[PDB]
Amino acid sequence: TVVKLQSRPKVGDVVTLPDGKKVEVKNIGVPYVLPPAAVCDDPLCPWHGHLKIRLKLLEVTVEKVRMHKAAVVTHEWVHYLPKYNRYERRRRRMRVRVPECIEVKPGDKVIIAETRPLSKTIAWVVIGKKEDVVEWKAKHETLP
Amino acid sequence: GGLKKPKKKYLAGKPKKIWNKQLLLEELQLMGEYGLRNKKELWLARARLKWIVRRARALLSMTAEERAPLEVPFKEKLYKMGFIEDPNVPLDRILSLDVRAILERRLQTLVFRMGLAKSIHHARQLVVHGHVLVAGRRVTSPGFLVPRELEDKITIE
Amino acid sequence: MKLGAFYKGGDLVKPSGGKKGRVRKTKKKALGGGPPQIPKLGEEDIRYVERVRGGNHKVRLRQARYANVYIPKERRHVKAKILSIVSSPSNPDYARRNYIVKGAIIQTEVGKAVVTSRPGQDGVINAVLI
């Protein structure tokens, strides 16, 4: 169901598991995240399945990985209090979907993307760890 | 969940301590010279005076760039109403503006100061009964704050 | 159908397990559901067309006798007959009461097939031979 790889593939590659099924690393529309270093066959996977994500991305840290194909991550931000003119650090725990091709541990910073709802509390999925990010810039064409 | 309703516009000129002797003496003089009806009219004049001064205070605190578009038009509008005399004074000169300059612009005062009536209370009675034509139209409100250009059009019946 | 007996609205339970109040007193008709309509193994095929939300229509198989079995190894479609329901992995009580659901095995005339459609929603039994 999950076959690891000695090297990472690219978007559009087709890799066949020991079962002989061919899985193509789809293009999830986010060009600054690398595909996982292993392949799964889950139809709810965004890399190797039919799952479609939205363009909302968040960077969180894994807290509890003891649910099946899911994890408990923490989301952090800073809130301004106008009366005191100071900040407060707020955090919220979210439930997210962890695909089989992506392995996570507590304390690790991952990337999540909003999808359609998958369970009572899961609507976000781990797109990939932070280290699979890549620097990206837009295009700036100008007529002199 | 709050619905806006109008508030008194003479509150800005109202003193929060009415029971001062020197305060009572100065205000009683002002009502006598200009023939006002009650202290509400006198406070309403001061509320106008506080607007002219507080506005000039804020324009001073604005930056030179910000002050520039509003500086000359503010003084020009003050000149046309007849409150000030020079529309080209420094902006801090407006800060010392005095409430009597607003009371002179009252239509009742202008009828008396133009020699069109026997007394200031008679000139109030003239406007009230409708014998004072401002550019050909009857203006019956004695507290009308006449601007500069309309002042020369004041006639009697 | 949109029946309040099969209401598909949200629970009254938080993820923490605590209870929460009811924002709305009544059950909305838009969030209503319906009873199951999966067909039963019968001696003839009976189809019922149902009017649904927005004036649309859904084909319901009340009673199923034939299956459009398809042979992958031959690429032919046969409208074979159904003899018994071998087993229903989602719930054995479907096979125990002769009710056909998607993913169920059927011992058809040509052999065995796995039901590949939702017979309460599609209205036909598309089957693939094993």
Next chain:
Amino acid sequence: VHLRKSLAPYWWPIPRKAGGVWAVRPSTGPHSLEYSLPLAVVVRDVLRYAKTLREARYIISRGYIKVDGVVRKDYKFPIGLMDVVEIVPTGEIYRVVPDEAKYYDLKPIPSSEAALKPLRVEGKTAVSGGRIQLHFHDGRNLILPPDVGRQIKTFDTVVYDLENKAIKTHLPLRLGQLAVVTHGGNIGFVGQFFEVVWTLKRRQSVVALRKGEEVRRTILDYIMVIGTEAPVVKIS
């Protein structure tokens, strides 16, 4: 369906407080509610030909008003960007164009360019027969063969013949053309397209327009190409 006067669009040329508590609501025509004005409002407010709503309905009920070559007898018909409004018994023609003050204005136009309408391609769909369907900024559609519809990408402006149901001229969206901003704060501005920051979503790309040398920026969604240095049809 009602429309409270408070909920009316902000740019409409009507007083906000004084009047009734109601406003005429457009009847889901070929525009958007936020970006369209009903016909009865135009006849009563923008042209001032009717003093009441009944008088405006009477004028419209006679078919005196033609909108893009079709006589509209609905007083709640929506009018919007680049629409051609023609008054039959007087012979005057207007093209509702993006205005720097009124946000949308009735500008008189010559009778020659009355049948022409510049339409911005909002998207294409593949239809039966393999043909291509084009969707324009006012919801209008046009089905074309696959090869001809391949070369017309989204945001390209095409000058459409209302009289022949055809495409007179296709204006691709490339850097260096004349564009008019059709929505947002910078409405009414016409300038050269000379700068783009292509974002991940193309509709949200940052675009810059120049008019020697006032430079305004918007998103790519909010600009229509009106051609090269000469605008093809009178808009200003």
Next chain:
RNA sequence: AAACCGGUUGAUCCUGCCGGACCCGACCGCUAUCGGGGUAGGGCUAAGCCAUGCGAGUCGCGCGCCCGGGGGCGCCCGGGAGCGGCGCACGGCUCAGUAACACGUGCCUAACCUAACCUCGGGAGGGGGACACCCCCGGGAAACUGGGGUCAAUCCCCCAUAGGGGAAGGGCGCUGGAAGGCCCCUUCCCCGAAAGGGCUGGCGGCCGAUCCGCCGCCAGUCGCCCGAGGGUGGGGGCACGGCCCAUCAGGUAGUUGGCGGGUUAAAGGCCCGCCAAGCCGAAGACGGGUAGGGGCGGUGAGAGCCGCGAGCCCCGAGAUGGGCACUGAGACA
């Protein structure tokens, strides 16, 4: 106007409370001439109980019938009881429930439906039926309602074709950030349209003053069906923001997730079969209390405090308490 003044001492300097002076909101007392502007008035009190009246209709250019006046070509006009279409889910009221995806801001539906309307492409062939008003009788206090006869439709139904849905295999192609989508090809199963109807004018034909029509065609106009998109309305999802109490510390067991299914217009423990032990909590769970949320409003020189966060606008919920359905695009009205 960025303000103080009175009072604990025999006297004094403090601390520290309480009072005075001001604005606004509710109720009340005494008094009360006129006008202008304003979205003021059983909200702050019982979402307590109610006599009476009024509060959603319209269309004869969908349909037949009846009545009265007029006229000959083929009818004109007025009226009646109805069928039928569309609307009555908008609008109006109130503040019990709600600490919640209710509300606000910013985003999604690639997981969805949408009558009326707009645009592009295509279509309108064949054949049947019934029920009102009415007529002959009623029944019943009334509400309501029965039988026979009888004229129609844009009323209802069938047949054909278009089209549509599912399952499966392929593809150049389209959209789009990204295809479980669209388009094309192949196989099977299954469902399955339409009102060429009204009006106007022209032509011709059938027919007859006991008829005042019917038929074919043409044009104009208002309509009907299908495919695609828009529009509008709606269902659903997400991130974050906004009360008090620890004299409330552990709570949860469909509870948290996985897999397979059902149902839905549509994703989802929404529901079901199996598997696991997970889920929340002192960064305050759980429990209790209070409260419709916002735009906003009062006050202060301001920071801020308060809600008079009643009246006006937007969203929500409700219709004596609690439930459940019909019709319909949309209601559980």
